[PDB]
Amino acid sequence: AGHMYNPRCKDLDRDYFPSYHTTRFQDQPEPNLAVLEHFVRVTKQHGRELTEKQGITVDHLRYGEGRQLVDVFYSEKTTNQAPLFVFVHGGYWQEMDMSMSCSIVGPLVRRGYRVAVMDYNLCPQVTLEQLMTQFTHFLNWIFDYTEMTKVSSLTFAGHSAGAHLLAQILMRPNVITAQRSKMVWALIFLCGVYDLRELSNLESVNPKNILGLNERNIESVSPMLWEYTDVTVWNSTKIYVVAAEHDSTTFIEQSRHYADVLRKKGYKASFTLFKGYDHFDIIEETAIDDSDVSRFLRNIEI
C-alpha cells in the first residue's frame, strides 16, 4: 500500500533520506555516505574560495543569539541598491551550517547581487516551532536591513529544510506587509519538504521527537496543509517549486503536490523537475556560473 507521497514505497525511512537516491558514487560501497562526505567537503571548499580566490567581500553579521548569524557577500562591483538574494540552507533542522551553505554566492555576486547566507539554531536546542518563530524574526530583520540599505528587490531561496522554513513568508502578514511582499521578486523552493506528518513519526528523521511535534502542532509546521489567504499581495512575485530528478519519489511528489497547492490557491507558481540532478549537486553546481542550475537562477532575473 506504500505511503502518502509514494504509493509503491518499500522503505519509508529511505524515502526521507535523499542521499540514498543519487546516481553518483556508485563505485563506492555505500554511495549514500560518499555523497554526503563529498557534499560537505566541496561546499566547505566553495565557502573558502569566495574570499581566498574569487575576490568577494563578506560582512559577518549577527541577527540574534546562538546560531542566528548571517554572512552578506558582495564585491567592489556591487551597487548601493543592489538586490539581495537570501539563501536558507537545509539539513533537516538538525545539521549543516553557514560553512556548507555558500556554493550559491559566487555567480550571483558576479551578476551584481548582494547575497545573504543565513544560519539558524538547530533542533533539539530549539523545537521546530521555536525555529519557525526565530525564522519569522530573521525575516523581519532582513526586511529591516533591506529597507535601511534601499535594496531594489529581494529573492529568497531555500533548500530542503530551508525551503520548508521559507514557506512561512507567505503567511506571516503581521511581519510581511503588503509593501514588503511587493519587494519580493522571486521565491525559489529547492527540494523542500512540506507535509511533516510521516516524518514526524520516523526515528530516523525525528529521533526521540527532537523536532517537538504532536497532533496539536503538526499542521502548523506543515506548509502543505495551510489555508493560504491574501494571495493577491503576492501576485507580482514569481514562485519556483523545484525538485531533483534523482531524489526519492516522496521528495519529488512533495514538491509536485506543494506546487499544485500554491497554483490552486492562485499564486504565480510553477513546478520544475531538474533533469540529471540529485538533492545535493543541485546546490553544489550553483558555484559554477555556467551550470544548468546556475543558469536557471540567472534566467529568473531576466
Q: Which residues are catalytic?
A: 160, 247, 279
Mapping DSSP onto H, E and C, the string for the chain reads CCECCECCCCCHHHHCCHHHHCCCCCCCCCHHHHHHHHHHHHHHHHHHHHHHCCCCEEEEEECCCCCCEEEEEECCCCCCCCCEEEEECCCCCCCCCHHHCCCCHHHHHHCCCEEEEECCCCCCCCCHHHHHHHHHHHHHHHHHHHHHCCCCCEEEEEECHHHHHHHHHHHCCCCCCHHHHHCEEEEEEECCCCCCCCHHHCCCCCHHHCCCCCCCCCCCCCHHHCCCCCHHHHCCCEEEEEEEEECCHHHHHHHHHHHHHHHHHCCCEEEEEEEEEECCHHHHHHHCCCCHHHHHHHHHHC
Interior CA angle at 45 toward 40 and 48, to 5°? 130
